[PDB]
RNA sequence: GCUUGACUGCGAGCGUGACGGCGCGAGCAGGUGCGAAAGCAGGUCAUAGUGAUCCGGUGGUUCUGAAUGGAAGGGCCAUC
RNA sequence: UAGCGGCGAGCGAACGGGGAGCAGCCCAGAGCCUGAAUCAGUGUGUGUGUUAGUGGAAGCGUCUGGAAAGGCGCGCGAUACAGGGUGACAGCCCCGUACACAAAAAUGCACAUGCUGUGAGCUCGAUGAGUAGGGCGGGACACGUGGUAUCCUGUCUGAAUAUGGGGGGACCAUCCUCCAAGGCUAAAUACUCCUGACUGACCGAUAGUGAACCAGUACCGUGAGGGAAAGGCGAAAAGAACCCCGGCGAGGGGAGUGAAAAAGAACCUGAAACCGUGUACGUACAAGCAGUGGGAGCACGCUUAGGCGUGUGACUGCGUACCUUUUGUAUAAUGGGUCAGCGACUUAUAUUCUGUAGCAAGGUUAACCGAAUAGGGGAGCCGAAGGGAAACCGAGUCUUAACU
């Protein structure tokens, strides 16, 4: 029994291919190097999946220091003073408290004020 | 009952190694045989009994003893092989006709290795002291 | 191609019932007057092959 | 242990180990893959590096040109001149043991019947060698894919069913493992019944 | 001073080695030595003074002995 | 296995047993009676062949369709439903097949009978000399000079005559068995340049022969020698009448043939590398394995808002290819220009272990016969007993004078 191999060859080819579009030159159009590339962006999603949570909780600490400092307060405090008045909310809900309801938001720094002392 | 609804049982048809085929089949680049060396290459391998080149075990020992040639042509015979004899005579011949000890036996003995219950006339073979004991127990007569 | 024994190994070494096998003794064939009757006396009887020897020797013997 | 009989009326008494024992599922399948593994013929070949056509010199010296380094015009990674490890004519026949033969035939054939799917009649022959009344014959014991066994080897039952693809005509000495479980419906005759079960036992 | 234990067959159990090996050893049996005797003695205060296998040489042992009776050759033991 | 063997690597019988197949004769010599059985060439009637060949059964209607052998509804033949072709898949259209036949002429094959060369049957005799053996030197026997039998002999020597000789693994005696130094002889075995039929878990144009094709050709070499690449229109050539551009071009556009020119001969299907045209988005103050995570804007489908799909991706965090080899590689260490195709743990026979199946103190046959995957064949092999170098003994044995 003699196996010719192009067609499984050609879909084994093909699936690389298309997980290929996009990218640039020999990378889109190549086997050889749209193989190399497709592993490579397998490897940066493994990654940057991981590195997602760490960029958006950079993010929220960021904006809850930005708006505590428009209200009067530094980061470290505040995040003391809601934990010595035990509220669980975390940091992306705060970012979004200090982007859309101000109000709400110095209603929360005036809370951990209260605790922080 | 049909062509096509039979199968065999499981652990009868174990595949096999088919080495060199992906990172992902556990056996290919090089497949099982490491790296470099005399082991990896085709054909390679040392032979039967090769010890580096220190001296190996059957060159090591000495040699010891001789082959009979007397041995060769004396078979044994147990005591549940003469219930076989067809007739309750055992002879040089009539265990040769039973298929028990072979063409070119000459010298034949009679064992104790089972049980005997049958009177059987056991002629022209050595006898063991147990055997003996346990054919004159059955009923038997053991002449030389 | 039936297997052929590795024939000076038929020649040093003997089955035993268990599969093991016996061998004479090295150091008795010569020089002896320098070795003590004590040494000579052990070196007498046969032994059995160690355990890390067995797999070379069943190698070098398969129809025993 | 009683098989009956369909059109004569008169009942018959078989052996209960070769009719009624239990299928073995893996004896059954050894014994098939084996008759249709020594079905096979074995007639191939190709070539290896020592039979191309061909001359066995050095195309290019072994050190200074550009080239990765060759031997031979009959390499296997060359073209034309391929094959590696190339097939010789070799026979695919297995050992079947006696008894593991005749126990799968047991188990089968007690399937055969327990599956309603064996005929025992008195007789079974026609009377000239015309595969049109063996037609007739055989659409009117509602049988379409049968396979005939007969005790005494019989000339106008051969020929009479030597054309028809869904009927086979067997002696009880020529049963084979394959065939009794490709055929819907087994017709046996008393006298076969009798010599398959002296044969099996 | 007297002597030959610088004996023969073994060996509980250990030590040390990858193995081949090397080493320590109470006690058993036969026979001996010295001492009144209990005893001690299987070489030297101990640790180096060494060389596998094959091939053969010498003596003992009818174990084997290519039809049989021997014999040659072989085995086993002591040894080079 | 026994043995042989720098007793290393390895080499490797025989006796005996089961099968296929079986066949014995002649001269060395005189006679009786001549041709009486068998061996080689030659005319002639017959059997089997090979060499041309002959007959050879059974179907129609209708829907899609270019076209029916397909679907659908109904019959028929079959000792024939092997295979191939026919405008798509045919038992019933054609070639055929199963079965039955047919040779004026030459030839093969075992006998018959006619011719020729040769000799049936039998009294009695005889019995293969520079030979066997030996010295020296080689070779073959499984056997390498070893204690080495046996066979052949280059060279040198050299017997006896059935009251004699050879062998039985140095050699001698007994016993057993045969008669060298002269020849012929079917069968069982080996192979396929060629022929005919059939088969294939063999290949399908980089495969299978080097050669599907005008291939051992074109081409290369002084020569020996080496040695290619190259299959496909359609069902049918119906292979594009004619017209227009152009050079009485090439090439194209129509018309026409066709089911189809998304079959026009550079001809089925028509992949990828590679190269273009058009459209959407991005890009001319911005630095690096070109991605990934987030992400504005735009384009285009959305649902009848819903912050989602598809394409692009300003900006921003992180991010120095792959393989191999190494203690360690972004490494300025190796290898790859890319695509497509082929390209590397196989096969036979033995042996051990694991799983699984059968039978079980038993299991199983091999060659071969075959009514051929059955059935027979138990020749054998492994196991149920070991110990000992061995004779030998045996649930024991060896060591030893015997063993705590």
Redesign the interface.
Do not use: T
């Given at each position: 029994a003699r196996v010719k191999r192009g067609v499984i060859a050609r879909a084994r080819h093909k699936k690389i291919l298309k997980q290929a579009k996009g990218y640039y030159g020999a990378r889109s159009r190549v086997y050889r190097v749209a193989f190399q590339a497709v592993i490579k962006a397998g490897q940066y999603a493994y990654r940057d999946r991981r590195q997602r949570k760490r960029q958006f909780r950079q993010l929220w600490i960021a904006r809850i220091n930005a708006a505590a400092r428009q209200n009067g307060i530094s980061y470290s405090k505040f995040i003391n003073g809601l934990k010595k008045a035990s509220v669980e909310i975390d940091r992306k809900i705060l970012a979004d408290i200090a982007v859309f309801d101000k109000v709400a938001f110095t209603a929360l720094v005036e809370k951990a004020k209260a605790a922080l002392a | 009952?049909?062509?096509n609804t039979?199968?065999?049982?499981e652990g009868?048809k174990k595949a096999g190694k088919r080495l060199g085929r992906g990172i992902g089949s556990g056996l290919g680049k090089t497949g099982g045989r490491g790296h470099k060396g005399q082991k990896s290459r085709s054909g390679g391998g040392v032979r039967?009994?090769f010890?580096g080149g220190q001296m190996?075990?059957?060159?090591?020992?000495?040699?010891?003893?001789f082959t009979s040639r007397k041995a060769a042509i004396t078979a044994e015979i147990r005591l549940s092989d003469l219930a076989k004899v067809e007739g309750g005579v055992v002879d040089l011949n009539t265990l040769k006709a039973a298929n028990i000890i072979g063409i070119q036996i000459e010298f034949a003995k009679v064992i104790l290795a089972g049980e005997v219950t049958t009177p059987v006339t056991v002629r022209g073979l050595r006898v063991t002291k147990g055997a003996r004991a346990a054919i004159e127990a059955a009923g038997g007569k053991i002449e030389e | 191609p039936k297997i052929k024994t590795?024939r000076?190994?038929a020649?040093?070494?003997?089955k035993t019932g268990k599969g093991g096998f016996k061998?004479?003794?090295?150091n008795?064939?010569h020089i002896l007057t320098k070795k003590a009757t004590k040494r000579k006396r052990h070196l007498r009887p046969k032994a059995m092959?160690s355990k890390g020897?067995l797999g070379?020797?069943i190698?070098?013997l398969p129809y025993a | 242990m009683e098989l009956v009989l369909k059109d004569a009326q008169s009942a018959l008494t078989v052996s209960e180990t070769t009719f009624g024992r239990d299928?073995n599922?893996?004896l059954?399948?050894?014994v098939?893959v084996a008759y249709a593994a020594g079905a096979r013929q074995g007639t191939r070949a190709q070539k290896t590096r020592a039979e191309v056509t061909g001359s066995g010199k050095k195309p290019w010296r072994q050190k200074g040109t550009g080239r990765a380094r060759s031997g031979s015009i009959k390499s296997p990674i060359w073209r034309s001149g391929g094959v590696t490890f190339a097939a010789r004519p070799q026979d695919h026949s297995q050992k079947v043991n006696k008894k593991m033969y005749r126990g799968a035939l047991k188990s089968?054939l007690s399937?055969?019947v327990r599956?309603d799917?064996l005929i025992v009649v008195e007789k079974f022959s026609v009377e000239a060698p015309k595969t049109k009344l063996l037609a007739q014959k055989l659409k009117d014991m509602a049988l379409e894919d049968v396979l005939i066994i007969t005790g005494e080897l019989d000339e106008n039952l051969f020929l009479a069913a030597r054309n028809l693809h869904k009927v086979d005509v067997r002696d009880a000495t020529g049963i084979d493992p394959?065939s009794l479980?490709?055929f819907d419906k087994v017709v046996m005759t008393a006298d076969a019944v009798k010599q398959v079960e002296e044969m099996l036992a």
């Open positions: - | 009952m049909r062509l039979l199968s065999p049982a009868s039967r009994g010890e190996p075990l059957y060159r090591r020992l000495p040699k010891f003893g | 590795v000076g190994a020649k040093r070494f003997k061998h004479k003794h090295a008795l064939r092959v020897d070379l020797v190698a070098c | 299928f599922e893996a059954v399948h050894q098939v089968i399937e055969l599956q799917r394959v479980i490709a």
